[PDB]
Design an enzyme around this catalytic site. Structure first.
Site, short mmCIF file in Angstrom:
data_model
loop_
_atom_site.label_atom_id
_atom_site.label_comp_id
_atom_site.label_asym_id
_atom_site.label_seq_id
_atom_site.Cartn_x
_atom_site.Cartn_y
_atom_site.Cartn_z
CG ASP A 1 8.20 14.06 8.42
OD1 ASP A 1 8.00 15.11 7.75
OD2 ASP A 1 8.45 12.97 7.87
NE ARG B 1 13.44 10.64 -0.77
CZ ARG B 1 12.67 11.55 -0.18
NH1 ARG B 1 12.51 11.55 1.14
NH2 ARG B 1 12.04 12.45 -0.93
CE1 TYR B 2 7.43 3.16 3.42
CE2 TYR B 2 7.36 5.32 2.38
CZ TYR B 2 6.81 4.07 2.60
OH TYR B 2 5.63 3.75 1.99
N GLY B 3 11.29 2.53 2.47
CA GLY B 3 10.95 1.13 2.36
C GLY B 3 9.55 0.95 1.79
CB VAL C 1 -1.03 0.02 1.15
CG1 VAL C 1 -2.05 -1.10 1.02
CG2 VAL C 1 -0.34 -0.03 2.50
N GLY C 2 2.15 1.15 0.07
CA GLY C 2 3.02 2.31 -0.02
C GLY C 2 4.45 1.90 -0.26
N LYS C 3 5.21 2.72 -0.99
CA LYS C 3 6.59 2.42 -1.30
C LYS C 3 7.32 3.76 -1.39
CB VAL D 1 3.42 0.67 4.36
CG1 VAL D 1 2.32 0.17 5.32
CG2 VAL D 1 4.32 1.64 5.05
C1 LIG Z 1 2.42 6.90 7.57
O1 LIG Z 1 3.06 5.96 8.39
C2 LIG Z 1 2.51 4.67 8.41
C3 LIG Z 1 1.26 4.34 7.88
C4 LIG Z 1 0.78 3.02 7.94
C5 LIG Z 1 -0.49 2.72 7.36
C6 LIG Z 1 -1.50 2.20 8.16
N1 LIG Z 1 -2.71 1.93 7.71
C7 LIG Z 1 -3.03 2.13 6.44
C8 LIG Z 1 -2.11 2.64 5.53
C9 LIG Z 1 -2.53 2.84 4.19
C10 LIG Z 1 -3.31 1.90 3.52
C11 LIG Z 1 -3.73 2.10 2.21
C12 LIG Z 1 -3.40 3.26 1.53
C13 LIG Z 1 -3.87 3.47 0.10
C14 LIG Z 1 -3.53 4.68 -0.50
C15 LIG Z 1 -4.11 4.83 -2.03
N2 LIG Z 1 -4.86 3.83 -2.42
C16 LIG Z 1 -4.27 2.36 -2.17
C17 LIG Z 1 -3.78 2.23 -0.82
C18 LIG Z 1 -2.64 4.22 2.18
C19 LIG Z 1 -2.22 4.00 3.49
C20 LIG Z 1 -0.82 2.95 6.01
C21 LIG Z 1 0.25 3.47 5.05
C22 LIG Z 1 1.55 2.07 8.59
C23 LIG Z 1 2.79 2.41 9.14
O2 LIG Z 1 3.60 1.48 9.78
C24 LIG Z 1 3.17 0.16 9.81
C25 LIG Z 1 3.26 3.71 9.04
O3 LIG Z 1 4.50 4.07 9.57
C26 LIG Z 1 4.52 4.32 10.95
#
Ligand SMILES: COc1cc(-c2cncc(-c3ccc(C4CCNCC4)cc3)c2C)cc(OC)c1OC
Ligand SMILES: COc1cc(-c2cncc(-c3ccc(C4CCNCC4)cc3)c2C)cc(OC)c1OC
Ligand SMILES: COc1cc(-c2cncc(-c3ccc(C4CCNCC4)cc3)c2C)cc(OC)c1OC
Length: 286
Positions: free
Chosen positions: A135, A17-19, A13-15, A21
């Site tokens: 941040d 510089r940090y890695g 669900v995310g990509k 998610v």
């Molecule tokens: C910001 O930091 C963090 C966020 C999360 C996190 C938690 N729950 C849901 C999300 C998410 C889920 C789906 C989508 C979408 C976006 C567009 N459409 C498709 C998919 C975006 C975000 C995320 C990123 C987790 C972390 O760590 C484990 C984290 O780092 C501490």
């Protein structure tokens, strides 16, 4: 007894510089798994050290589940596991959702609540040190199904008892006058960034049939991936601030929010409102 540690990774669900998610599953329940890049290992250590010092538990803070370090042949793999918020970040949500008065205020008050909880030292046995986030931005806020938000990503956080995203940096960070020896300085950097987030959200609140398109702060005066110098010129030299559209002044809620934003953006950090005062002001709107 059995210690079930397997997590099924289902969708990235995310990509960045940090890695990455991932949405994952553990014992039938959704979790979020942040897999750290080598470049960002320090953020895992900082967040882990913080949670090892104080187990934060708040409706408006992203819920911690675990930190994992696993030895590999030539490397070390670092995971942070949290609750999963299927609606994604505030940044994502605002792209194609507009808001009404109630939903706008619910979002911003929930952010202020999480931020005040971080900032405020609590004494005694169930207490916590004061914490500055460092941040804050709409990509670091997640939206919950109940209409509130929670603040995420404590990898840069500092406690009191990588640098921030340039677009959201306060003037004193950009001009290098921040009083690095005073914890309150870091709180005031968070308040500046909160004001920018408030502006981002308010633009998406409908009034009188009008709404602004989603834009990031300073979209009209800096490039994508603005440099440090780009930001310093805008924020410090020219002392520009995000535009407040005329239409906000026809709506009592947006008028009050514009005043609040302005009080988060003073060039003098000690003039800015505190998170607690922002909460109070928001509870008296509408
Ligand atoms: C910001 O930091 C963090 C966020 C999360 C996190 C938690 N729950 C849901 C999300 C998410 C889920 C789906 C989508 C979408 C976006 C567009 N459409 C498709 C998919 C975006 C975000 C995320 C990123 C987790 C972390 O760590 C484990 C984290 O780092 C501490
Ligand atoms: C080591 O790694 C992991 C363990 C778990 C995990 C799995 N099942 C049970 C547990 C557990 C929790 C508490 C207690 C105690 C507490 C004191 N007295 C009574 C009972 C026993 C066991 C835990 C921690 C989960 C992981 O991920 C999601 C995980 O990896 C990060
Ligand atoms: C890390 O995350 C999770 C751990 C567990 C989990 C598994 N087994 C045992 C436990 C436990 C049991 C008892 C006690 C104590 C401690 C004080 N004295 C008496 C009571 C603590 C912990 C727990 C929490 C469950 C999760 O979800 C459902 C979970 O979230 C994903």
């Amino acid at each position: 007894r059995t210690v079930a540690r397997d997590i099924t990774l289902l969708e990235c669900v995310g990509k960045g510089r940090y890695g990455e998610v991932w949405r994952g599953s553990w014992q039938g329940e959704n979790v979020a798994v942040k897999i750290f890049s080598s470049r960002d290992e320090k953020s895992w250590f900082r967040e882990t050290e913080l949670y090892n010092t104080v187990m934060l538990r708040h409706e408006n803070i992203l819920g911690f589940i675990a930190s994992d370090m696993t030895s590999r042949h030539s490397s070390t793999q670092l995971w942070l596991i949290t609750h999963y918020h299927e609606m994604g970040s505030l940044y994502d949500y605002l792209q194609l959702t507009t808001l009404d008065t109630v939903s706008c205020l619910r979002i911003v008050l929930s952010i202020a609540s999480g931020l005040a909880h971080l900032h405020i030292e609590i004494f005694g046995t169930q207490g916590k040190p004061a914490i500055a986030h460092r941040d804050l931005k709409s990509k670091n806020i997640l939206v919950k199904k109940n209409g509130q938000c929670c603040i995420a990503d404590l990898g840069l956080a500092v406690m009191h008892s990588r640098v921030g995203t340039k677009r959201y940096m306060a003037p004193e960070v950009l001009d290098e006058t921040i009083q690095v020896d005073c914890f309150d300085s870091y709180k005031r950097v968070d308040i500046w960034a909160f004001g920018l987030v408030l502006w981002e959200v308010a633009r998406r609140m409908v009034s009188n049939g009008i709404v602004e398109d989603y834009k990031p702060p300073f979209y009209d005066v800096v490039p994508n991936d603005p440099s440090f110098e780009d930001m310093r010129k805008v924020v410090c030299v020219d002392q520009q601030r995000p535009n407040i559209p005329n239409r906000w002044f026809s709506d009592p809620t947006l008028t009050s929010l514009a005043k609040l934003m302005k009080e988060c953006w003073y060039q003098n950090p000690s003039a800015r409102l505190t998170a607690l005062r922002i909460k109070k002001t928001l509870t008296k709107i509408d």
